[PDB]
Amino acid sequence: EVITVRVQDPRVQNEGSWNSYVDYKIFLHTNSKAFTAKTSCVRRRYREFVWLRKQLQRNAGLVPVPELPGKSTFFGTSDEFIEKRRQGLQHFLEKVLQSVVLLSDSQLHLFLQSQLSVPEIEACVQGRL
Amino acid sequence: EVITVRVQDPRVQNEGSWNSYVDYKIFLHTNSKAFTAKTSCVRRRYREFVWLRKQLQRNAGLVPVPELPGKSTFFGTSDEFIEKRRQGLQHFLEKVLQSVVLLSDSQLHLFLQSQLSVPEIEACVQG
Ligand SMILES: [Cl-]
Ligand SMILES: [Cl-]
Ligand SMILES: [Cl-]
Ligand code: NA
Ligand code: NA
């Protein structure tokens, strides 16, 4: 029944380049059978969370899905933007995990416990990987 | 101290005339000590929001102030255009007000809690 999630450690990938982006470490510790691993650590970027939230909104129960932190850049500093984003991503996952139809989602499990890309998850869930 | 802002009740002013326009009720309630009124209700039109943002962005320097909804009528109907505008205007104010960055801006206060026109605000703050 314990599922503890943390979002930490923003890092810049491909820094300086056309395709630079920030990603976040996601730690999960759980004794839940929802998950193949008791402990996992993966990195995900904001756009993958956007993909995730939309996938969760296809849930079979039509249950509402917690909000993500937004795209607003209205911050004195980039550090503040990233920290508020990090907090908001962690809060999002905490709340997702409290909803049984969302917690049990097979694509959530692939998001949290693998580093399959979004297209790779999409291929996996069609048996095309 | 929280600031609650709502943009509601779009209405057509001067309906059927050359100078017809839509405006919006801006309702604010706050326990923030800086505001002159705990609850205010003013009406503002889109062009006034455009004026406001320009003033706010000058104050912010290179910090990017929240975007306004645009002019392009990409929604299918006037009703949908106005409702999405209203939502966008509320979102703009929510983001503006939820940060400490612009809360000292004289123009913002007069926009929100007076029914001074834009020229009158400009005159007020210029002396
Ligand atoms: Cl971007
Ligand atoms: Cl497969
Ligand atoms: Cl009228
Ligand atoms: Na084990
Ligand atoms: Na209305």
Short mmCIF file of C-alpha atoms and ligand atoms in Angstrom, two decimals:
data_model
loop_
_atom_site.label_atom_id
_atom_site.label_comp_id
_atom_site.label_asym_id
_atom_site.label_seq_id
_atom_site.Cartn_x
_atom_site.Cartn_y
_atom_site.Cartn_z
CA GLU A 1 0.00 0.00 0.00
CA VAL A 2 3.00 2.36 0.21
CA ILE A 3 3.88 4.15 -3.05
CA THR A 4 6.38 7.00 -2.60
CA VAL A 5 7.28 9.12 -5.62
CA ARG A 6 9.80 11.91 -5.90
CA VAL A 7 10.79 14.19 -8.73
CA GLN A 8 14.30 15.60 -8.32
CA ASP A 9 17.53 16.70 -9.90
CA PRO A 10 16.71 18.68 -13.04
CA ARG A 11 19.55 18.30 -15.57
CA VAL A 12 20.10 19.95 -18.96
CA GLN A 13 20.50 17.51 -21.81
CA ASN A 14 22.31 18.48 -25.05
CA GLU A 15 23.16 21.80 -23.44
CA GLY A 16 23.92 24.57 -25.97
CA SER A 17 22.42 22.67 -28.90
CA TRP A 18 19.32 23.05 -31.00
CA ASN A 19 17.73 20.09 -29.21
CA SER A 20 18.60 21.06 -25.58
CA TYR A 21 16.01 20.20 -22.93
CA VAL A 22 15.70 19.67 -19.19
CA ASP A 23 14.78 16.34 -17.66
CA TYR A 24 13.91 15.25 -14.13
CA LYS A 25 14.78 12.16 -12.09
CA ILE A 26 11.74 10.19 -10.94
CA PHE A 27 12.21 7.92 -7.94
CA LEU A 28 9.55 5.37 -7.06
CA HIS A 29 9.54 3.10 -3.98
CA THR A 30 6.66 0.76 -3.57
CA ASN A 31 5.43 -2.60 -2.32
CA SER A 32 2.41 -2.36 -4.70
CA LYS A 33 1.67 -5.12 -7.21
CA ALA A 34 0.83 -2.37 -9.71
CA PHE A 35 4.59 -2.27 -10.32
CA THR A 36 7.17 -4.69 -11.61
CA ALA A 37 9.96 -3.13 -9.53
CA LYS A 38 10.00 -2.18 -5.89
CA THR A 39 12.46 0.61 -6.60
CA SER A 40 12.86 2.49 -9.90
CA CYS A 41 14.67 5.57 -11.11
CA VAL A 42 14.05 7.03 -14.54
CA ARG A 43 14.42 10.43 -16.22
CA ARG A 44 11.56 12.19 -18.00
CA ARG A 45 11.10 15.62 -19.56
CA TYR A 46 8.06 17.97 -19.44
CA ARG A 47 6.69 17.02 -22.84
CA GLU A 48 6.57 13.40 -21.75
CA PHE A 49 4.47 14.40 -18.76
CA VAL A 50 2.15 16.22 -21.17
CA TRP A 51 1.84 13.00 -23.21
CA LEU A 52 1.18 11.10 -19.94
CA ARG A 53 -1.58 13.38 -18.71
CA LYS A 54 -3.44 13.07 -22.04
CA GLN A 55 -3.04 9.28 -21.93
CA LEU A 56 -4.42 9.24 -18.38
CA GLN A 57 -7.39 11.29 -19.60
CA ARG A 58 -8.31 8.29 -21.78
CA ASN A 59 -8.89 6.25 -18.60
CA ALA A 60 -11.85 3.90 -18.73
CA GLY A 61 -13.50 5.44 -15.67
CA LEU A 62 -13.65 8.96 -17.14
CA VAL A 63 -12.07 10.13 -13.90
CA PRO A 64 -10.48 13.57 -13.89
CA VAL A 65 -6.70 13.70 -14.06
CA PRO A 66 -4.63 16.00 -11.84
CA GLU A 67 -3.25 19.11 -13.45
CA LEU A 68 0.37 19.54 -14.51
CA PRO A 69 2.28 22.70 -13.70
CA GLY A 70 1.98 24.99 -16.68
CA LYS A 71 4.09 26.43 -19.38
CA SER A 72 4.20 29.96 -17.84
CA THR A 73 7.70 31.47 -18.12
CA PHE A 74 6.76 34.41 -15.80
CA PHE A 75 9.63 34.08 -13.34
CA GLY A 76 12.41 36.35 -12.25
CA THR A 77 14.82 33.45 -12.73
CA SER A 78 14.96 30.19 -14.67
CA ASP A 79 15.89 28.44 -11.36
CA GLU A 80 12.59 29.42 -9.86
CA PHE A 81 10.73 28.23 -12.97
CA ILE A 82 12.42 24.84 -12.88
CA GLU A 83 11.92 24.40 -9.12
CA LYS A 84 8.23 25.28 -9.30
CA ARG A 85 7.98 22.87 -12.27
CA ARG A 86 9.80 20.15 -10.27
CA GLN A 87 7.46 20.64 -7.30
CA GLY A 88 4.43 20.58 -9.59
CA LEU A 89 5.54 17.40 -11.39
CA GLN A 90 6.02 15.67 -8.06
CA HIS A 91 2.64 16.86 -6.82
CA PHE A 92 1.05 15.68 -10.09
CA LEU A 93 2.48 12.16 -9.65
CA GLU A 94 1.54 12.00 -5.98
CA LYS A 95 -2.06 12.80 -6.85
CA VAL A 96 -2.12 10.44 -9.82
CA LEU A 97 -0.97 7.62 -7.57
CA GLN A 98 -3.87 8.30 -5.16
CA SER A 99 -6.46 7.52 -7.82
CA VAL A 100 -6.90 3.79 -8.26
CA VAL A 101 -7.90 3.83 -11.98
CA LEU A 102 -4.88 6.08 -12.76
CA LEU A 103 -2.39 4.25 -10.47
CA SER A 104 -3.17 1.00 -12.25
CA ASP A 105 -2.68 2.40 -15.79
CA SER A 106 -0.35 0.23 -17.84
CA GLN A 107 1.20 3.20 -19.66
CA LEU A 108 1.82 5.04 -16.36
CA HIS A 109 3.79 1.96 -15.31
CA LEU A 110 5.90 2.12 -18.47
CA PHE A 111 6.44 5.89 -17.95
CA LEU A 112 7.59 5.50 -14.32
CA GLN A 113 9.50 2.24 -14.45
CA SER A 114 11.07 2.20 -17.93
CA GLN A 115 12.92 4.64 -20.11
CA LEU A 116 11.01 3.76 -23.23
CA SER A 117 10.35 6.85 -25.31
CA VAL A 118 6.78 7.95 -25.88
CA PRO A 119 6.72 6.39 -29.40
CA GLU A 120 8.26 3.24 -27.96
CA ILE A 121 5.53 3.03 -25.32
CA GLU A 122 2.93 3.57 -28.04
CA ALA A 123 4.52 0.72 -30.06
CA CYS A 124 4.75 -1.55 -26.98
CA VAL A 125 1.06 -1.20 -26.14
CA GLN A 126 0.25 -2.26 -29.74
CA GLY A 127 2.70 -5.19 -29.70
CA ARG A 128 4.78 -3.47 -32.37
CA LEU A 129 7.99 -2.79 -30.40
CA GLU B 1 -2.46 36.65 1.39
CA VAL B 2 -4.39 35.38 -1.67
CA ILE B 3 -5.79 37.35 -4.60
CA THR B 4 -8.90 35.88 -6.26
CA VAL B 5 -9.62 37.31 -9.71
CA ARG B 6 -12.40 36.40 -12.11
CA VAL B 7 -13.15 37.70 -15.60
CA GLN B 8 -16.87 37.24 -16.23
CA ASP B 9 -20.05 38.44 -17.84
CA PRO B 10 -18.95 39.61 -21.28
CA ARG B 11 -21.36 42.27 -22.59
CA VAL B 12 -21.78 44.28 -25.75
CA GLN B 13 -21.55 48.01 -25.17
CA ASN B 14 -22.99 50.51 -27.71
CA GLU B 15 -24.64 47.51 -29.46
CA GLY B 16 -25.47 48.23 -33.10
CA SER B 17 -23.30 51.35 -33.35
CA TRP B 18 -20.01 52.21 -35.00
CA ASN B 19 -18.33 52.21 -31.61
CA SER B 20 -19.76 48.94 -30.35
CA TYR B 21 -17.36 46.78 -28.36
CA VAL B 22 -17.32 43.88 -25.90
CA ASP B 23 -16.24 44.31 -22.36
CA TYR B 24 -15.72 42.07 -19.38
CA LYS B 25 -16.40 42.24 -15.68
CA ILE B 26 -13.21 41.91 -13.59
CA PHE B 27 -14.10 40.88 -10.08
CA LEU B 28 -11.36 40.82 -7.50
CA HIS B 29 -11.39 39.82 -3.82
CA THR B 30 -8.32 39.86 -1.67
CA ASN B 31 -7.12 40.19 1.88
CA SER B 32 -3.86 41.64 0.56
CA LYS B 33 -3.20 44.86 2.47
CA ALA B 34 -1.72 46.65 -0.58
CA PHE B 35 -5.02 46.81 -2.49
CA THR B 36 -7.25 49.85 -1.96
CA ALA B 37 -10.42 47.74 -2.02
CA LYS B 38 -11.02 44.25 -0.60
CA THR B 39 -13.53 43.64 -3.38
CA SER B 40 -13.71 45.44 -6.71
CA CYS B 41 -15.78 45.13 -9.82
CA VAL B 42 -14.73 47.00 -12.94
CA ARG B 43 -15.33 46.53 -16.61
CA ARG B 44 -12.50 46.40 -19.15
CA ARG B 45 -12.34 45.75 -22.85
CA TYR B 46 -9.67 43.78 -24.73
CA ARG B 47 -7.73 46.82 -25.98
CA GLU B 48 -7.33 47.96 -22.38
CA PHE B 49 -5.74 44.62 -21.49
CA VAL B 50 -3.39 45.12 -24.52
CA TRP B 51 -2.42 48.54 -23.15
CA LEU B 52 -1.89 47.07 -19.70
CA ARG B 53 0.41 44.30 -20.82
CA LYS B 54 2.66 46.73 -22.61
CA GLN B 55 3.06 48.73 -19.40
CA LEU B 56 3.65 45.59 -17.37
CA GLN B 57 6.27 44.21 -19.76
CA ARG B 58 8.19 47.51 -19.62
CA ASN B 59 8.21 47.13 -15.82
CA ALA B 60 9.37 43.46 -16.04
CA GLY B 61 12.32 44.20 -18.34
CA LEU B 62 13.41 40.91 -19.85
CA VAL B 63 11.18 38.78 -17.53
CA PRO B 64 8.35 37.56 -19.86
CA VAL B 65 4.94 38.73 -18.72
CA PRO B 66 1.97 36.39 -19.30
CA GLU B 67 0.55 36.36 -22.80
CA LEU B 68 -2.92 37.65 -23.66
CA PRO B 69 -5.31 35.72 -25.88
CA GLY B 70 -5.07 36.96 -29.50
CA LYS B 71 -7.12 38.75 -32.21
CA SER B 72 -7.48 35.90 -34.67
CA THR B 73 -10.99 34.51 -34.87
CA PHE B 74 -10.01 30.82 -35.28
CA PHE B 75 -12.92 29.51 -33.23
CA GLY B 76 -16.06 28.77 -35.18
CA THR B 77 -18.43 31.26 -33.62
CA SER B 78 -18.50 34.70 -32.00
CA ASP B 79 -19.79 33.00 -28.81
CA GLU B 80 -16.83 30.62 -28.68
CA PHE B 81 -14.37 33.40 -29.56
CA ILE B 82 -15.63 35.54 -26.66
CA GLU B 83 -15.73 32.67 -24.15
CA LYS B 84 -12.18 31.59 -24.98
CA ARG B 85 -11.06 35.24 -24.79
CA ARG B 86 -12.68 35.57 -21.37
CA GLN B 87 -10.91 32.43 -20.17
CA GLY B 88 -7.63 33.78 -21.56
CA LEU B 89 -8.12 37.14 -19.90
CA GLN B 90 -8.81 35.50 -16.52
CA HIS B 91 -5.70 33.32 -16.97
CA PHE B 92 -3.61 36.37 -17.77
CA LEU B 93 -4.74 38.14 -14.61
CA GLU B 94 -4.33 34.99 -12.45
CA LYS B 95 -0.72 34.67 -13.59
CA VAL B 96 -0.05 38.39 -13.25
CA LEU B 97 -1.44 38.51 -9.71
CA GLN B 98 -0.04 35.16 -8.38
CA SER B 99 3.50 36.45 -8.65
CA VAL B 100 5.17 39.21 -6.58
CA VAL B 101 6.94 40.70 -9.62
CA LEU B 102 4.28 43.27 -10.79
CA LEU B 103 2.20 43.86 -7.63
CA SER B 104 3.72 47.34 -7.12
CA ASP B 105 2.67 48.53 -10.55
CA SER B 106 0.51 51.63 -10.20
CA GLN B 107 -1.13 51.03 -13.60
CA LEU B 108 -2.18 47.53 -12.66
CA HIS B 109 -3.95 48.79 -9.51
CA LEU B 110 -5.81 51.52 -11.35
CA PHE B 111 -6.74 49.12 -14.14
CA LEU B 112 -8.18 46.63 -11.62
CA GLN B 113 -9.85 48.81 -9.01
CA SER B 114 -10.76 52.17 -10.64
CA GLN B 115 -12.96 52.96 -13.63
CA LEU B 116 -10.37 55.53 -14.87
CA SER B 117 -9.96 55.20 -18.68
CA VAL B 118 -6.55 54.39 -20.14
CA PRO B 119 -5.81 58.02 -20.94
CA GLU B 120 -6.81 59.00 -17.42
CA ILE B 121 -4.51 56.37 -15.93
CA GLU B 122 -1.63 57.59 -18.08
CA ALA B 123 -2.34 61.18 -16.93
CA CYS B 124 -2.61 60.06 -13.26
CA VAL B 125 0.78 58.35 -13.18
CA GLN B 126 2.55 60.98 -15.31
CA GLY B 127 1.20 63.80 -13.10
CL CL C 1 9.40 25.34 -25.88
CL CL C 2 6.09 -5.50 -28.59
CL CL C 3 -25.50 48.61 -25.37
NA NA C 4 12.11 -8.15 -5.40
NA NA C 5 -22.28 35.57 -19.41
#
